[model samples]
Target: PKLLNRLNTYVGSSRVGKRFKLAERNSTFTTELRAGTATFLTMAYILAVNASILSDSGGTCSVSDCIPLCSNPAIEPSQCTGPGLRLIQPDVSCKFNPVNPGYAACVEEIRKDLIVATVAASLIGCVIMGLMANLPLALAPGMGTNAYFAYTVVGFHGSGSISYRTALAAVFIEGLIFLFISAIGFRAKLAKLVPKPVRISSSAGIGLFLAFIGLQNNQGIGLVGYSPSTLVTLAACPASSRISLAPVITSANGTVSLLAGGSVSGDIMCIHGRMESPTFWLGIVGFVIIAYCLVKNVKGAMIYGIVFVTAVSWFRNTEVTAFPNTSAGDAAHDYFKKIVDVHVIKHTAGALSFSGINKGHFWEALVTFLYVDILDTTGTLYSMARFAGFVDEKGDFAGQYFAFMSDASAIVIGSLLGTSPVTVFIESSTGIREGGRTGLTAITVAVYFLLAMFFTPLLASIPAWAVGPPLILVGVMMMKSVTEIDWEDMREAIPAFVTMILMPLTYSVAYGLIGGIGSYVVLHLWDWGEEGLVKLGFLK
Candidate 1:
């Protein structure tokens, strides 16, 4: 509590102080806590999710034997080797040879190219998203969404699973589609068709969705069973339970019991259990806090909400155990270790290998690029912009080009660097909450992101739990915008209400958006005559 108070004081008194004054005015300590925690958590969530996604997709290399392999070219000719080496022995691989002079030269070349590309992409995304649209969000290739594209679309529709070239083609196609939409201004037009009340509801709904995603990821929570009538319940085990759910217990001294005894002997049915990814929970907490703060119109409510969430997470002391590397067999571990070390050296120098670029799975690449540049960028920009007060009554800033162009450039640059797409991040809202009203804040953020590349380890060390609270708070804060809707008007209120409810329930911003638009359109047509119909005719 003492530490929290001190931190809150600092946050409230700093250069960013005025931004949070509303929370102080309202005496909403919980809101402030949640907002701060959510900001931290959202960043942590992005990093963890990106790392996990890349690791699963064979994007990451280990460091164990990399140094030795780099020193001896004969042992590791391919700096981008995967799990397989029949000739190298563990003992032979471990023998440390003098650092190869050529290794530095090779790594330096790769680093220069990668850093330039990464920085270029980062800057491009920043300029487009920040300057043009006035949105505080950033863009990047999404994790699970890309994988879905790879497996479901590319693998099934294009070439065989082994042919990654087909996948790249798909990603490219998606990118083209995105470009077409943005260039033609169709995306902006579509966004405007959404009613203001519904839009606010959708924003609130997204806040909930984000918070829920954060929660599920940070904490392992999920559905366990369905009732006879199909009702679903979220099953969470008690903290003290060794097993996640119910466990059987027997007492022989007093009385022995089996499955058929009426004397306190019954079937011990344990709920299904699965360890959830951290991203889900972090998102959930973030949405909740932001929503709360928004509803209350409390200043700095987003920041305060985050701080509170982090406090609770720290008190809980959530523990995440590292997973073992299951990809390599015992004999292949040593060979892989050398590859990792070399990769780390390369990474430290700011370069990623281009070995896989020519091996383009066209379809995979196309889908990956498309989603990153289009749907992901669009959703993030619209949602974040609305939350940050970029959108107004007349929808004046809807057609901005900088943000979209930056997003596209980021994907193009990120792809060349051997990392997934880099785009606008949602956490930019934190700077907005701190009175970041111009491109200067985004420039500051970009600088920090570039600097972060060198201190990856330190950034990784920040626990997901510590960040969870802020996300929740941010969600609460964003949701407050919903109050602007006139609930007294049935046409506006009904659609807004539905939009808000569906957001968290469906666990998707896209879904909420679709629902809101559909309902708003239906309600508007019913209330107003066809005279106002032309503006929304394109939606059909």
Candidate 2:
């Protein structure tokens, strides 16, 4: 008992403890303990949730399954390595290797690398936020940003559009830019520059974006299974050639064998039986049940809904061919995807492909990233910090500077570490609502994230279908921000509406942000007069 008392004293009032002022803040040791555990439970979902999302982005790359990746355009294409492919041999450190080295190695890698990078970034970010910023917020791979990273920066229906490695380069650049601005006071300036309507609408926009992604993820939640097809058609436009495939089919997980049935088979094609799909039927039933749960204000409603949907929608493995060449081997491949053991991998090499990034593509991607990251972080910091009583007369958090610093630095560091940007988890609000205060609450979050590194197998088992629901529900939660907008005023409503709707419509945050900002600038300038001063200080 005496020894325990000494340990408690050391933690509560020692030099380190005093530096953080645990007692001065009226936060007891017991308070910190419970707050940490509560915060972890609230956001621990991100561990499995994010890992599932990242893995599905490009999937698990391993030694045998690796396609050649070129590190530099100048070097021989073959002269590259892969992401630390795990498990064919037990003699390697399966964890991400960020030790005193660099990327551009060009190696075979997998989603396990993504899993580890996110884990490492969140672990490092939460620790930094707590210890350095003295704030009670846990940082992790953000929700909308990861979905953007997967479907936009990396995924599209084209050959060699860009790799996640290249996407990391953009993330790294945005981080540096953030750090530079945060130091020069530019980060603060944006809060004033972007209108409040547009700001909150970004969150609402992402909510819609995530909801679409959930449905688009596999189509079971909403994308392809309901209406399986091989031909995609664009909405007709007069005197236009396709800038891209005009007919956009967002998400549909289906087999050619299942879809081998019928289509119009022309320049523009249509599948015959969209409404008749088996998966489609199951999805509707699941959707209704989930919606009912949501209406009842049930927690974990989406998760439960997903469970039931999967139970009924589970694949019925069979021959997917015209039969002569089909064998048991092929049938088995449907269920057994090639993979490695549960381990963490990082995108050290991929993120380092600085030279590989296309300038035009990279800049636009960087812009969207900055707008989304900064706006969401700003919004979360503004709301949650105030909710926790950290705000002052001006409604700004005391630690705003250090908090933005943590956010900007974490994104940069996380890019180098190879994953999407880690920001303050909105879930921290859950713990703060429970009366958590001081950095002690954040330290607990860091500790819990570090522990999640061991549960990779369990996380990996969660299928995309199950993952889709939480995103759907979270999107619903985020959409409430839309009501805060002044809908009656056309001036405010137009810009905000542009920002929110364009995100899902164009299938690009880059597009959405540009449209929103452009419209706002055009209208807001006319708010004062036609020329609207036409000066540098006009915005303020």
Candidate 3:
């Protein structure tokens, strides 16, 4: 007992304890450590998931690098012919095939690189959050921001307005801008400047966007598929029934050919089967496990479901196996069997390009990133602190400035490390509930992320089925804030509803926000003009 008392005194008077104010905050070293472990377990799923989503953008791969589709065209010209099958380029024909092995190989390499980037960026953010902000909050490359970066800005397989490299440049510039605003202490003012309904409904809009991604065939559980008449329908078919579509142009001769420079769409429509996908059923099972755990108030409910689904899909002979019996599947399975390996960031790290800096899309992406990030991080910081009982009556907490600075600094560093904007995670509530009150909890999360880097091989191979359930569930959680919107007034209701529905429909978070804000302005133009006329004595 005496020895334990001396050990406690030694730690209490030590620099580590005083630095985080352990006793002052009514926490002990052990408590903070435990809290951090809880937080890391809850948030660790980001290691694989972020990398998986971002790699869909096809980092550093271009049309020039693709191999020829028909090497022996004279003998095998028919090999590339369909209703709309023509060479995309002389050297690379099926550049946009639903399953282009040549392009898939490049994207596979990108996935490995992004796995490392995700871990490194997340580690840096959490470390800064721990040492600089001295808060229990954990930061990671955010969910909605990453989805926008992949499917919207960079586009699937490098098909957006800007190249993947140019998008990174936008993210880099956004971070510096955020840092400047945070340094000047203009965060709260800027946060308040956004309209109330727009700000409140944006989360739900992003939720719908994420759920749409989760329900799709290529990206998620394959519960939804493309339709010819209505544009979307129930499509849970096996891979054999899926087919890719290419745009075709008809000439004066009454014959159709593939449009030049046109992109091919994925296996979006189910031709025969519906709800018969083995993997889709597996994903549903995982969703049930996660839902059951959440109902029981489990701490790592999300991770448990993801791990279970991933493990079951690893079997070599199972019908729902992730690794099919093909050359590409064999290669992926070989790599997955390695189980533990360190991956270096080769393609994405330091890959930011300034060539597109002068383009209009560049600035548009930059401003969108900045706006979304400001709302996301600031709101999360305040909410987490309030949940931990740290916010004062004035809606401020100690280390508030440092918390803002940490997030801004992390964003800059994360861009350099090749990730979307880093922001405080809502999962920190798990740790806060465990009595975490200081930076030590964040430090523990960082340490766990550091350890996660070595398991890149395993992390990178997590299948789409396993990842879908979490995104759907995450979308469900994000929808909880929709109840807070003012549905009584049409002025607020219309814009809010527009924002929520347009996100999934347009497949763009920025466009949804733009539509909502624009509609709000138009709806209020008459009222504002009348008030302005009264002030200027133009009207009685």
Candidate 4:
């Protein structure tokens, strides 16, 4: 009782208020606590979703370990598992239909590992941003870059230009570069150099990309899937009805080669049963709840929807239960039965590899990571600070330097934890709107993450259906930035449109930025030539 009284007195006094400026900022200890919880709830989906997305890359799991010992390289792992053939180990990234339960179990373990890593990285990130930067913003492994790292750089199932470990090396280097540039005050200038429309629509483009992922079967709600007639089609279906494709084998010069076409690696296609998935319907239900809450201006609306779906899906033997009767489901159920557990970071921590530096693909990945992240973090930081009314007439805010450094440092820390780049989340606005104005809000968020670290069993077990709703809504929120683009002019519109369209279509944020920037230069070439000619007096 005495300890509690002293703690309350200290928190309420002019000193605690003087440190965080709680009284001057017109925020109380209780208000800051509530604001931090609001921010944490909105961004907490990262605990489940980040691991779910990154695990698809197979983490530090060796490709060779899972490779099927087949007579020919042309045979897919799915088809190679017939008679006289033995899979040394199943590769989850190989796109097997009705995936090997054994490999799936390994992946589940990897997911668990990533969950712990994600929390640890975010915990440090929030603490740094709180203590050093003294900003209300919360940092975490960003949404867009993680998609790029897993799907583009590492490629699905470690099939990209660089391996997961190598990608982490790229991220690590990018962070050092980010720190150097930001320290020298070049970060904001770099963001300004990108064309206005490209910058505006880049966010909108990534929104589409996120929504695309959210609609798909692997990580999202299973609303869309692979189509034979079209590239993508409606594909919500019962899990059992989904099918995987066999690899196409072709003989060239009497040598068998595997062709990329027609190889739908995962069970991504649905032949018959459409809209039959109980999980899909449950995902829709979560979406509705989140939408309704947002409509009512409810705080923590996203978490509310996610928790409802996740709790419902946890019930065993239910129609929408996350743990089904299958081997993988049973394993998941057994783990979920442990309501509280602490998971150590294994398989992913300190997993960076520098071996791929000589390759062109590695350079490409590095450049893209640097480019997209420069704008992503800088823009979000500026906008969030501005929203909190901390920004001044010079378009700068207090602790701007440390905010950038904190973010750059977090990226390096995140890479070491085997995650993608970290950035200030737009979701921080939720807390800012709740009267959060100091680092106390961020510190509060970090404390919650510390508490959350012990519940890896629950956090990691959150179903995709529950996670998908938040991603979709986040996409909706990001799409709002597109309204700022000057669409009346073709020069601006075309590049902006390209940036928006290509991200989801190409399934790569890097490619979308490239396409937009390239198109912008090409479209403005005539204007540039005329200005140069006029300067030289050659046109006259």
Candidate 5:
């Protein structure tokens, strides 16, 4: 009895406890702990993936060493050292410099910067969400948007037209727009800021996107090519294995290509050949392992599954990350030396001059970022609201105004900090599905993100496949929301179906949302007449 009384006091003490109401909010400390840890494991892959993707922004492969499929942060890797390239899989900043410890050492410093920026951005955003909106959504540098920012907007050093400063300025301007919109509450008049159909569709569509990425990351899902013609077709791989594959323009023994999307102009996604490699099998097994974990309702199943697969498939071809005969403290010191990476954030990728913005059309670039920000934020927020059971009968979330602001604020701060636009991640669905219920859940996830900084190197070597399965699993869970739509009613079904399918098909969430929402209004206006619909407030 004494233990119970004392424990309850600490569980919900003072200002923080009273506001969060950890017990009354339908969650326990243990539940939040499990939910938060699971949340991190599922999305932790972003740290490595983001580092590699944006690392190219550090510069081009300054030398003639642009290796084909090395997973460093480069548009083209300059040179990878060690016999047979003894690659460390996904060293986020290695591609930036590409020489040994010189480049590697310098990159470790930058990688730390990237990690800390990401961690800080996630933490602040979550706190804002918890206090202002009082919801359990974890915000960070989003997934697809980062790639678009790194490659499309900023370009890879020599390849880009916009300088880092210009890109940040554009983002900075874009964030201000939403902040203004949020402050004025214009979001409410945008009736169905996210319509019923579009919200549900974004969930399923993004699910397919996640599954596609999982296959791409896993390297085990055999050459299941994704062409414009086939949509998606499995190759000689076994269906029973559930091993996924990337959307390929085509593939032969090994060289598979993506259909003219992402960083490269051509496909060339994986290694040139070698299907029989153990890495291939690792993919199939990893997928199966995660499926089982999810089916059994295991907490942190995604990260656990990733660890198992990476362990089973390593030490042969993988580079051994060596360290001097240094203690843990010394290793920390070695990595954290020079202490200048904070400049990456302090100066917004260190290009505060906005020189690129000077040359580019300000409105043109602003519209581009604004369009993406609106679609991605509204799309994910709606679906998450449903999953957490917070959506009202109107299908709009109550705290959406604050939710969107938290998202915009993240980008605004991120622009200042020298990173890409941070938004509400679709990955938050993982934590929600695992019983994350309130502000405490969001804060719990933030705490784990803070811990990610000291372990970036070891975490980097984790194969994309390890993270891939959970993404697919989360997608599966989100797709279930489709059943919530009135599929039997043509009025509701057409718009909903369009929204869901178009997201994955068009390869852009913005387009999917527009197509679905537009179709819905058009269909209704066609039947009811525009004047009548306008009088009904549907026009707004």
Candidate 6:
């Protein structure tokens, strides 16, 4: 009887323990929601920017159509003229093609080349960013930056434009310069010279800038406010009203004014408008869910919010018409059918053509490969390390090699799959905040990307609007970093603050970085003496 009584007491205590655990889990989720949103938004912004650049550069090849030749060599030569050609053709080559007769074929070839360039650029960017900064953020041809490259650099030659070979050469040279800096630890050294306040402010500025860009791109602006009576009357009056209102009301030929409707006008007040696209709405739903979790201090809000938004978008889009009855529609349907039939075979062929070091431009190719691998890997490592709390008290990074290796592998895999460089995303912090400390989280995320490879059609079907909400919410979440800034010190605050905001305002990470670094150096020299400069090794 005593043993039975003891068992009953233990069981009663177990119930309370379970409840407490549940409550704890919930609280953790609430706190993590903001971080999660920030991660998602950062990735989404990266993806969108990449997509836009690709479109303007000449568009991208279908992954399934290019993967095979990208992976292997023997099949690459033959496939180069057919579907394989669609995956590996160079944009410069396509531009020089005189055969306007086969427009569609030409387009495919251009897309293939663009894919190659994008892959090369992304890889180079990843490696450099990864190695120097230890941040997981991958760089690509940014929208504004690419525009500058095209209009100012490549297009400077006027109607004919600069040859692809020449442009590639310039890019190659830039890569070498980057490599020199990274190898000598110039970037890291420079970073150390920056004051704490400046760094904090700069980071915050970038966050806010990103938030602003998200709002502007995702939402439209409109005029607001009421108009004055005179403006309204003028607008409502007919064309003949001017003559009727004129001081000279004489003569046999008198003009009659015909007012059709009431009019009102004043100063054009600007107002921001919400997104109306389906994809945007889906993203908004995700944002709302995340916000709710944040406000309530719920746990795992980010994951749940993404899940909810995705579900609603999928359901709403199930039967929506994509193409209507027209010549273009019919052609698109037939083209799609053809694409589906040869998708696997073509990708396989492309994969067999993977020849890394000797593909095309020797130096260009080498620089592209090396830079991307280093930068992307370095960036991801730093970002992930920071979020994981693995950085030492001295702010030194640890476990960097493992992160670099992972990123390098991802890039290689991405290349074989006929896509641009893939690396560790700083946005992975979303998963990290959900108690994902081991490689398991990365593995899970990789699985999703792999699945995306095959489900390209479905992925493509998702609208920009649906993607925007998550991004906006994530940007908002990242804004939390702003609070960490030291506002008391003007020297530190000014430079750091500028760095943070300039990132989004200029829509270029490089710009933000340069601005921050430049300002920090100027301020340091102004405040501190020559001794301070010597100590920081600025003279060298």
lDDT of 3 by residue, 380-408 (tens): 89889899999998888988888988998
Weakest 10 consecutive residues, lDDT, candidate 1?
A: 261-270
Q: Which residue pairs clash in candidate 5? A: 56-73, 65-78, 221-244, 226-248, 258-267, 345-417, 348-418, 349-418
Quote the lDDT for 375 in model 4.
87
TM-score of each: 0.46, 0.72, 0.93, 0.90, 0.64, 0.48
Model 3, residue pairs in steric clash: none
In the range 1-540, model 4's lDDT, one tens digit per residue, is 676556545676767667777666777577788789999988887887788888877677754444454544466556776667655543544434444444566578878988888888888999999889988989888887877888889976676779889999999999999999999988878878888888899889988988888888877788898886796888889887888766656575676556654434677889888999988999999999999988998877887888899999988898778888876888888888898888888788888899999998888888888878898888789889889999899888888999999999999999999899988888899899988988899999999888888787887778778878887887888899888988999999999999999999998888898899999999999999998999999886
Runs in model 6 deviating more than 4 A are: 1-57, 60-213, 216-286, 293-398, 408-422, 426-441, 529-540
Model 2, CA-based lDDT: 0.63
Q: Report lDDT (CA) for all predictions.
A: 0.44, 0.63, 0.85, 0.83, 0.60, 0.41
Show the lowest summed lDDT stretch of 10 residues, model 6. Answer: 217-226
Judging by lDDT against the true structure, name the best candidate. 3
Q: After best superposition, candidate 1 residue 352: deviation in angstroms?
A: 18
lDDT by residue (1-540, candidate 2, tens digit) is 777556657777778778777777766566676777777776665775676566545532222232333444344335544564322221111111211011111221334466667777888888888887887788998888887776677652111255666678888888888878877878768767777778868878888888776654231143422122532232122111112122233346752232321221111122243333343345456567667876885443555666575444334452111111233323323322433344546434344567545668777778778877877888787778888888888877778888888888999878887777788988777667766777878888888767777655434444444556667767888899988899998888998999899887776677777788888878877665634555546554
Question: Across residues 164-187, which tens digit of lDDT does each residue of candidate 6 receive?
Answer: 234333344444444455545564
Residue 267: error of model 5 in Å? 7.2
- Best prediction by TM-score: 3
Residue pairs in steric clash, candidate 4?
Answer: 95-265, 95-266
State candidate 6's TM-score.
0.48
- In Å, residue 11's CA in model 5 sits off its true spot by 5.8
If ranked by lDDT, best first, what sequence of candidates would result? Answer: 3, 4, 2, 5, 1, 6
Report the poorest 10 consecutive residues by lDDT, candidate 5: 263-272
